[PDB]
Every structure is written in C-alpha cells, then in structure tokens.
Design a binder for these strands. Structure first.
Ligand SMILES: [Mg+2]
Ligand SMILES: [Mg+2]
Ligand SMILES: [Mg+2]
Ligand SMILES: [Mg+2]
Ligand SMILES: [Mg+2]
Ligand SMILES: [Mg+2]
Ligand SMILES: [Mg+2]
Ligand SMILES: [Mg+2]
Ligand SMILES: [Mg+2]
Ligand SMILES: [Mg+2]
Ligand SMILES: [Mg+2]
Ligand SMILES: [Mg+2]
Ligand SMILES: [Mg+2]
Ligand SMILES: [Mg+2]
Ligand SMILES: [Mg+2]
Ligand SMILES: [Mg+2]
Ligand SMILES: [Mg+2]
Ligand SMILES: [Mg+2]
Ligand SMILES: [Mg+2]
Ligand SMILES: [Mg+2]
Ligand SMILES: [Mg+2]
Ligand SMILES: [Mg+2]
Ligand SMILES: [Mg+2]
Ligand SMILES: [Mg+2]
Ligand SMILES: [Mg+2]
Ligand SMILES: [Mg+2]
Ligand SMILES: [Mg+2]
Ligand SMILES: [Mg+2]
Ligand SMILES: [Mg+2]
Ligand SMILES: [Mg+2]
Ligand SMILES: [Mg+2]
Ligand SMILES: [Mg+2]
Ligand SMILES: [Mg+2]
Ligand SMILES: [Mg+2]
Ligand SMILES: [Mg+2]
Lengths: 79, 80, 207, 86
RNA sequence: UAACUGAAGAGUUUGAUCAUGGCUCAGAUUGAACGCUGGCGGCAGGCUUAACACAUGCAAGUCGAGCGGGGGAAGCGGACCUAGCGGCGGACGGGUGAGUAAUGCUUAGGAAUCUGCCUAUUAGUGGGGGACAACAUCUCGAAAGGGAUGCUAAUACCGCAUACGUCCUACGGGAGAAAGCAGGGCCUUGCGCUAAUAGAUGAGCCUAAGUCGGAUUAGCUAGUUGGUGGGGUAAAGGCCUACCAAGGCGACGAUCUGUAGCGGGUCUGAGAGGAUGAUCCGCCACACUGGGACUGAGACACGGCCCAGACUCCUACGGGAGGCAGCAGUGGGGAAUAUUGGACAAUGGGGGGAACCCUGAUCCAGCCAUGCCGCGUGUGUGAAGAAGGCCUUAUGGUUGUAAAGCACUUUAAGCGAGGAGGAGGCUACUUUAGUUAAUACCUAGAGAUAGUGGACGUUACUCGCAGAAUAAGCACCGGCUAACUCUGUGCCAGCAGCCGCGGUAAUACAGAGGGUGCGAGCGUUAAUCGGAUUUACUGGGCGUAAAGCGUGCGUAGGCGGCUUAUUAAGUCGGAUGUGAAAUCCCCGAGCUUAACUUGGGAAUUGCAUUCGAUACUGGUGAGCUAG
C-alpha cells in the first residue's frame, strides 16, 4: 500500500537529493495517437548513492523540504 | 453534534420529508451524511406514509446521534 | 381556448365530412356548397398542393376532427414518439382515449363539441366521481356513466337515438338503459377510418 | 458594537487579554533564565534554573494559556541542552 | 419486463450549364426586452447593468435551578420582574462573485495534527486566599462617555494538597487539576466541573494528473534550490534564522501580459463536438479600501476590536458617531427585474431542569401573461340562402348555418351554506418497570375520560342559486412558405430575412372584402447551437477555382526491414474500492388530468488498486542481408 515510480536519474549535484525524470506514454483525447510526457521529481537521497544516468525506484513520503516529497527505495539497474 | 432529523422537500402545501443523519450545523436541506428513510404526512391511496430503515438508525444512535422529537416519535410509530 | 365559428366551412376545405353538426338529415347535404373550398376564389382552378401542403392539410383535418389545438397535439406526438410501439398509431390511440371522444361514441351527446359541453359542465361520473376535464385519458375498465343529477334534460334523448343507427364500436360496452358505459381497452388502427393517413404526420413533425 | 452583548463581549475580551499577557510573560521569563544559565556553562546552576521553570510551564499549559504539546516541546528541548553540559 | 431509435433541405453569380465558394432561410432554446391585445386557475421564476451611495424598521440572544444587590404589586414572609458580574451562543444560518490562471477547483490517494457540544469507559471533586463590577459619596461634559474614592458575592481569579491513567526522563525519578447548584427525604438521585482514552463529527497539512488565450512575450530566479545547528507550529516543511554549498525552473512554453470564481450540471447536436455555469446542491473567496492582532474548541470574525485612508453625520466647537454584496425600501444606472406584509402552527437553529423566550432561516401571503401546464369565452337546430358588405359576365357569386328566430345548458368567475388535511403532542387522572432506606423524588412504558394547540384561512373540497348571461386577439397571403381579388397611388409615397417590388391593369406599397396560421396570446429585436463536411477526430482540400516554401542540407521531433529469446511499459481481460444527493432515462404511486411531487432501478464506461494473457507496438540480448 505504497505506490512507487521508476525513472532515470538526471541530476545529483545536490547533497542528499536526486532528481528523477519519469516518462509516461499517454493517448491523446481528440486524435488518439500517443504522446510522450515527462515529469521531474525531486527525491531524497541519504548516502548519496545514485548517480547521473542511473534508473531508480522512488516512493512517496511526507515532505522533507520545499519541493521534495519522494524518497529513494533502490537503484534498480546501476549504470 | 450528529443528529437525525427531517429534511423538507416536496411541493408547496404538500410536504415530503427525508430522514437524514447529519451534523447539526449544516443547513436544513444542505449537506448530510446519510439518508435512512422517508415520511409522507399526506399519503393517499397506495402511497406509503413512513419508511424508516432501523438497523442504520440503531447504528447511528449508538455512535452518538441525537434524534429529533419528531424522528424519535416516528421511530416509535414504526416497528408497530 | 376553443374554436367557435362556422362548422361546415372547415368541412369544405378538407373535402371530407369531419363529423361535425350531427343530424338526422345531414347526409352532408346541409351546406349545398360542399366539395367547393371556401371564400371568394374557393375552387377557382386546380391546386399545386406540393408536398408540404398535403402533409399540413391532413394534419389539420385530424386536428379538426377532435378539437385539439396545436400545443396539446404536439405534446401528443412527442409522447407517442416515445412509447416503444410505432409513432403512427400511438397517436390515434392517444386521441381516441380522451374523455369527450369516448363519451361521444357512447351515445351521450350528438357532436363532440357537445360531448365536451357535457363533460366540462360536470355531468359525467368516471369511476364514481364527477370529473370536469375534457382530455382525461380513459383507461381499460373506466366506468363512464351519466351523473344521476341530470338524467332528464332532453338533450340526451335525441342524442341516444342518433347514436343508434350508427356504429356501436367494438370497445365500448354501452347500454342506453341506465346510461352506463364500461370502456374496454383502446381500439387499434382497424376500427377507425383508413382515409386518415398518418404516415405523413410523422414526417411533418420531423422536418 | 450595535448590541448589548456585543459590547459586553468586547469588555470581557480586554480583561482576558490583560490577564493572559501576564502569564505568557511569566513563562517566557523562566525560559529566559534557564537559557541564560545554559550559556554560562555551569551544569549545576543550569539544572537549578531548569527545576524552577518546569512547574511554571506546566501550570500555565494546564490553564490553557499555551498548548500542552508546546510545553512538552519546551521541556524536552531544554532538558536536552543541560544533559549535554555534563 | 423496461431504462433503447439514430442523420431531410431551399434561395441567390450565367443567355443557358456543371463545379467552387460565401451570404441568407426554414428548427430547438431564454432570468429576456419592446409593440398590439388581454378571463381564470396550478406549479415555478423575478437587478444579468453601478463589489454604485444608502434615510427608516426589523435580521442574535438566552439562563434567577451560578451570584450579590435592587424593584413594584400582593397578602413581616410568599410570588414576580431585571441594570451588573458570570456561563453558553454569537466562527452556524443568510448575502455576493470583486480578487484568484493555481496556496483555488475536480479525480485518485496520503501523514506528521487538533477538535466545544454528543456516545462509551476509567480515576476524582480536599482545603484556603486576595480582588473587582454593581452599590455608596465626589467628578469633567450640551450630549455620548469617563474620573476619583471607599464597600462587596460567586460555578469570576490565584496558590496549597492529592492524582488510575496524562507530560518529560539520563528509566533513578521529576511535573501538573477541579465548583458548585437543585428536587425529595446527613442519604439519595439529577444538572454540572477536573484528568484520560477512543469513537462520531468537523477542520488544518501533503502528493500526482487534469483545468482559457498570447512568442507582434525567451530566458527567470539570489531564502532563490539543497544541507547542518537553533528557533517556531496543533502538526511535516526556507515557515524563520545563522552558517556551508552552490544550485532549481524553462520550447512537454518557464517569465511576462490579457480574461476568468470551479464543479454537479443546463442548452444544442444522430453522434463526436460546440456554447454555458441564473434558480437547486458541494467547494473557494469577500464584507466601504489597505495593514494587524485579541478572545475562543474554533475567526485573523458581514450586523466584533485597533490604526491607517477616503467618505457621510451630530455638536452647545468642548466633543463624538458610522458601513444593506441580511429581509423589506429609497436615490441613481439601465432596454429591464416585486411588498418598508403574516406567523413561529410545521421542519430546523440558539439558550434553559422545565415553563418558555429568540429566529426576515423557514413556512406562508401580495405584485408581474416571465415561463410551463390545464380550463373557459357556450350547445342543438335554423334556407325567407333575410338584409348589409365585397366581387361581378348584372344576372349571379361569396361572406354563409354564419346571423336572427326557436329549444336548451350553466363548467370557471359570482352569491349563500357545510368542511378534511397539514398536530405529532402536552396538561391533568390511574397503573407497571427502573435505580434507591424507600412504594419518595426522578427517568421509562402501558389506559379511557376530558382540556389545549393552524399563520395560511372566507383553505382544498362538497352541495345549492340566478341568468348566455361576465370573457378574442395577433401575424401573414410574389417565390422560398400554408393562403387572392378590387380600389388609391405613378421610381413618388413606401416595402424588404434573401432574391427583389414601385416609371397608369402593382396578387410585392396603403385601405377593403375574402382566406391561412396560431390562439390568452401573437409578432419584432438580441443571444447560443443546428442546418454548415463552412476548421473536416468521426468527416475536406492544394495542375487550371483559395492553397507545394526558389532549391538543398540538416537539429529537436515523428515514423522505420527480417528471424529469435526474453520483458510486460502501450494493448487486452477479470476482481475489488470509488464515481454525494438532485438532475437526464425506465417501470409505477399521489395530485379530478397535466405540469408537478415521489418510491425503486438503470446510468454516471471515468479514476485507482490488484491478479492474469502476449498477437501487435516499445525495451533488452543474440542473429541475418532484399534497404
Ligand atoms: Mg509548503
Ligand atoms: Mg450574556
Ligand atoms: Mg439581568
Ligand atoms: Mg469572481
Ligand atoms: Mg473557574
Ligand atoms: Mg498544584
Ligand atoms: Mg478550589
Ligand atoms: Mg533539512
Ligand atoms: Mg529543525
Ligand atoms: Mg533550517
Ligand atoms: Mg507561455
Ligand atoms: Mg472577474
Ligand atoms: Mg453535424
Ligand atoms: Mg467557546
Ligand atoms: Mg487563543
Ligand atoms: Mg460577528
Ligand atoms: Mg449590515
Ligand atoms: Mg436589500
Ligand atoms: Mg433610469
Ligand atoms: Mg419554529
Ligand atoms: Mg365557482
Ligand atoms: Mg387539522
Ligand atoms: Mg403557395
Ligand atoms: Mg391600380
Ligand atoms: Mg399589401
Ligand atoms: Mg394555454
Ligand atoms: Mg461542424
Ligand atoms: Mg473544400
Ligand atoms: Mg491558383
Ligand atoms: Mg517547387
Ligand atoms: Mg533523428
Ligand atoms: Mg523509434
Ligand atoms: Mg501492462
Ligand atoms: Mg448521482
Ligand atoms: Mg541487432
């Protein structure tokens, strides 16, 4: 009962904090083709494990700062 | 306070009441939590005069609700 | 509102009888201008009558047979187009279930514009109660019966003769004895005329 | 105030405000004495400035002048600063 | 069993034709307005413009069973009233849409929170102090309102004691409450008060994705993005602060600018869409303009406080008062929108032990064809085809069974009589549980006799009475488009949605006779969708009608050969929660019918969670050679 998202690390330049980019394929309302949509989430690191180019699973939590409400769960495929 | 009262919607001079469980601060015909029956004081012919679901009435009374003096008389008029 | 004016003037425009002015020596020989349209250039020459005049003409004929104004008739059509039968004969069913029409077939009253004078005037007892609305739908089993308070006025004794000699349909179980009706179910589209064409009315109300 | 009870309520508001300000001031005063003993660095003077503040703070959180969740916080954060003296 | 049923075209470019392409028309709808006309009832609706300024009344009180003082009637005691202290209410209910383009709203989910009254369960309520109003004397002021000085109760205030559980803890210990009143016989119930838990309810906070234009707006940010210590909050958090680091957002439109309350829904359409957000329900925001905090369980408070602005008002010039976007009402603006009404009888709300008091919420009534629905303004006969009018071949034709005359009827309006329902209850008088010394008191329940309680209200409805008596208009008649003639006028006067009529036979102007359509209404103007496949997803085009950039090359992007293994994101299936009520639709029940109200369903095919299926598209690995 804790929803998670999987996405590509795109920045790590900050202490104890990554920025994941999540991508989503969504069908268009009137013309119904398909679209690529993306959202960047500021998530919370603790030991600074994740690096730019990595793909990680994050989960929701209480706020940690102004614009940070997701916590890292694992590095699913380190690369 | 949660209460159980009558909400009045019918027509002019011929009213029809819903029996409704609600916070007592809301408007008489406004927001409510649950409806548990109805009351028709005129009720000609083949039309019902009262219908009160009583298991939900007991549930809410035991949760702390306060029936009005008309709904407390109609809950004794029913089951009879 | 009703129509209160020349009765047979509307019979010459439509070319049929329209069943007004009921009388023992009508035979539609009470105008002698019959089959000639009204007014100055009545039947001056031929008429184009192109595909909207024929629809409107037959709709007017139906309306004038029963005495229904346009708003109520439009409502009838809208209700008939909603039932899950076929819009055509639902309309004639709805029009033959009125009160004044049912009470006109039963013999009380000669013309429908006097069956209405009887119903409206509180002289009919449907299911034991004096109703005075002329368009009440009469359902299967309604007992139509004259009010005991006026079974003497001599407007009825001739109406009950003219009723005889004439039809006695297969859906009203009348008896001109104690004046009690017992309406059956409604009729179907084989007990009323077949000149009345209603495939044009459905297309008139759908332009 | 266009009513009798409206200005009676205004009148009581003023007494209540005067009476509450004294007690809030009283709580802040003792928190200040404990804090200015924690600056000194004397573990003993500090544990004696803390034992004279806790009852005032709890008495005033019982009357409703502060919230009890706020007195609990003041107690905890002021005990965790004299335990770290010695 | 039903809850589905669905789609029309016409006129106008030419001497004629086919195409293209605009313009116009026939439909539905409205919080409408105007013009001509106007009998009734039932249901609704009624400032869309100036969030413009507001005279007058009313819209929030209640408790003497918390507490002193008083007062007047009545027979020195009973009853009764209330200025002041104190409790609770005043944060609901009612209005309005200025601001707000996302700190809002909708859909689906979360933590880190508080919560008066109410229900349940636990431990209590011990003993003392010092004040202040009222009051009694001074006292400044025209008034409003203060000023001095003494005197006082309390469920007002503050110590002390004791705490099942509650708070902090370094697990050793430490800290912290409260108040009485009433009815019957110190003992009994009630009503309260304290501490705690957890339920109800109600509020605060977080996340993701949706929510109107503009690039003739491309860079924006410096508590800005992150971290550590401290402060702060009911509670997570740059919410605040000092340091350290430097970041964060932006062509998937940031920043800037314009407009705008949002949804359930409403109108239209075969659908897909398109317009819209009055009346009813939910949420947000605001209260003369801007800035604050107080009290409280809750407010940054419409009829509360402070201080800034404007603005109005009184004045004795000393000094003060105020906020209709609450209901009525006034002025003003406008094309345009109602009474300075009744009752708390019913449903709710506040206070009270109750009696009962308050309630412009509400229930009702007045005004208005504003809409929807229903009824009436009579019914039969009646050929001397009367007269009159209009046309005319002068004889006829039409108005026309139409009218008279004769025979009837009396719905609704009117005048008299009867008369439900909306009131369940309460007070007395008996009797049985109930806890208790107790058959007192006090909570409950059974019974017939009475008493009392409706604003609407001359109620609905019923039954009588007199007499056709009291009751028909508006648009049109060249085509489109149902329906034609005469006279007057002579490109004049005029008409007109489009084509177009009018210059001496005008079916097109004006009147008249006849006709057509609707009918207590009928026409015009305005606005939305349709027709319009005329922005085309469903569902169009680009040689010559409007339309292929002068030509390459290339960035983001879109799309991409064949075989195989795997994955399971798109895709497909099932299950579970959700999708408020009302509304739409379908059965069927009350209104004499109908509008209308209402029972049950169906629908809300969207969202999320979870379990599966792998053909196709994507990802990954491994191969191939037709590009
Ligand atoms: Mg925040
Ligand atoms: Mg008071
Ligand atoms: Mg008093
Ligand atoms: Mg607004
Ligand atoms: Mg106290
Ligand atoms: Mg103590
Ligand atoms: Mg005490
Ligand atoms: Mg931090
Ligand atoms: Mg901190
Ligand atoms: Mg910090
Ligand atoms: Mg932009
Ligand atoms: Mg606006
Ligand atoms: Mg279409
Ligand atoms: Mg309070
Ligand atoms: Mg406070
Ligand atoms: Mg207020
Ligand atoms: Mg006001
Ligand atoms: Mg007003
Ligand atoms: Mg004006
Ligand atoms: Mg009341
Ligand atoms: Mg009458
Ligand atoms: Mg009654
Ligand atoms: Mg024609
Ligand atoms: Mg002429
Ligand atoms: Mg003319
Ligand atoms: Mg009508
Ligand atoms: Mg279209
Ligand atoms: Mg084209
Ligand atoms: Mg060209
Ligand atoms: Mg070229
Ligand atoms: Mg490429
Ligand atoms: Mg690709
Ligand atoms: Mg999948
Ligand atoms: Mg619903
Ligand atoms: Mg390969």
């Amino acid at each position: 009962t804790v929803r998670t998202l999987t996405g590509k690390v795109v920045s790590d330049k900050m202490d104890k904090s990554i920025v994941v980019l999540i991508e989503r394929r969504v069908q268009h309302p009137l013309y119904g083709k398909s679209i690529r949509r993306s959202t960047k989430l500021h998530a919370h690191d603790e030991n600074n494990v994740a690096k730019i180019g990595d793909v990680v699973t994050i989960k929701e939590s209480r706020p940690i700062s102004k614009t940070k409400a997701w916590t890292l769960v694992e590095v699913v495929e380190a690369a | 306070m949660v209460v159980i009262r009558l909400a009045r919607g019918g027509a002019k001079k011929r009213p029809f009441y819903q029996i409704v469980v609600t916070d007592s601060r809301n408007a008489r015909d406004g927001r409510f939590i649950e409806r548990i029956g109805f009351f028709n004081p005129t009720a000609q012919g083949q039309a019902e005069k009262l219908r009160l679901d009583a298991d939900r009435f007991a549930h809410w009374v035991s949760q702390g609700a306060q029936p009005s003096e008309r709904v407390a008389s109609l809950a004794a008029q029913a089951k009879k | 509102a009703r129509y209160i004016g020349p009765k047979c003037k509307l019979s010459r425009r439509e070319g049929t009888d329209l069943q007004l002015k009921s009388g023992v020596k009508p035979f539609d020989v009470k105008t002698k201008k019959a089959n000639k349209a009204p007014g100055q250039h009545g039947q001056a020459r031929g008429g184009k009558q192109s595909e909207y005049s024929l629809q409107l003409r037959e709709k007017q004929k139906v309306r004038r047979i029963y005495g229904v104004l346009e708003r109520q008739f439009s409502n009838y059509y809208k209700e008939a187009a909603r039932v899950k039968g076929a819009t055509g004969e639902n309309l004639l069913k709805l029009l033959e279930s009125r009160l004044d029409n049912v009470v006109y077939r039963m013999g009380f009253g000669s013309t429908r514009a006097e069956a209405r004078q009887l119903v409206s005037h509180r002289s009919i007892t449907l299911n034991g109660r004096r109703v005075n609305i002329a368009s009440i739908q009469v359902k299967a089993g309604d007992v139509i019966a004259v009010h005991e308070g006026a079974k003497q006025q001599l407007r009825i004794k001739n109406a009950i003769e003219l009723a005889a000699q004439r039809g006695i349909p297969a859906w009203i179980e009348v008896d001109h004895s104690k004046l009690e009706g017992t309406f059956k179910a409604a009729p179907d589209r084989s007990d009323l005329p077949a000149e009345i064409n209603e495939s044009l009315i459905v297309e008139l109300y759908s332009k | 105030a266009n009513s009798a009870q409206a200005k009676k309520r205004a009148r009581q508001n003023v007494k209540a405000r005067k009476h509450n300000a004294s007690l809030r001031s009283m709580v802040r005063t003792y928190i200040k004495r404990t804090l200015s003993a924690i600056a000194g660095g004397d573990y003993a003077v500090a544990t004696e400035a803390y034992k004279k503040a806790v009852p005032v703070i709890d008495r005033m959180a019982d009357k409703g002048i502060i919230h009890k969740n706020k007195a609990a916080r003041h107690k905890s954060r002021l005990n965790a600063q004299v335990k770290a003296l010695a």
